[PDB]
Amino acid sequence: CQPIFLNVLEAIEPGVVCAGHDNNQPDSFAALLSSLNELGERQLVHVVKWAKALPGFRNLHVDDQMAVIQYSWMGLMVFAMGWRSFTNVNSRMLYFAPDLVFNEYRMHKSRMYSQCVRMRHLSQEFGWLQITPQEFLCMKALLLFSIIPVDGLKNQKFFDELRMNYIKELDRIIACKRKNPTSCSRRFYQLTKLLDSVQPIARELHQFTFDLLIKSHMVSVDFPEMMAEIISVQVPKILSGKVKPIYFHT
């Protein structure tokens, strides 16, 4: 038998994305953030194309399709970035883009050093936990179905069904090569725990970007069109508690 699911995830996995950052200029907060915002914009495009091509994704109500994307983009991009950092530079730095790699010095200048160390720890997790390329792909797909609005979705039933299936596929990935149900359970524990630790980080980044937007005109930080729109219309909903993450643990 062949893995139809994993073949799809592997096939739709977006390629390298550049930030268009001028590494010839001395570092500065304005330039670093303004570049991260541009990077975010670019990656968003790929995140849309990626998601639209996910198994059973089109079964979701068109409105819910756009919603889960606007709520989880952060966690998805942070998770994907933590993985590039582990596979490209063995977590020595934050590999946001080939043309935008952060060392402690840059983490500091970005004024979000603590958050960055958080992401470095996340990057190292892929190592200590020995996260296979396949487990990663499935984990990322799942993060798109990890943050729902308290008032519920247009069609909350479909989402629950879809999300369920992806968890079912993650059970298969873990079940593969593992014959004992205890090690299967023990592994699910670790992955779900790892997937949860992504939310606190996303939250901090959500809050940080939110404030940055409000005082952007004062600190000379440029926000791309969509970025500003999402952060001012969707992000606030998460920060105000109207939209919440789905943790596996408490």
């Binding site: 968003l44 495009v45 639209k52 399709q65 756009m66 994307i69 969509m226 999402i230």
Partner: peptide, 11 residues
């Protein structure tokens, strides 16, 4: 949301 919508629409 109005810009993300157009992006979403045209893939």
């Amino acid at each position: 949301s109005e810009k993300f919508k157009l992006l979403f629409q045209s893939y």
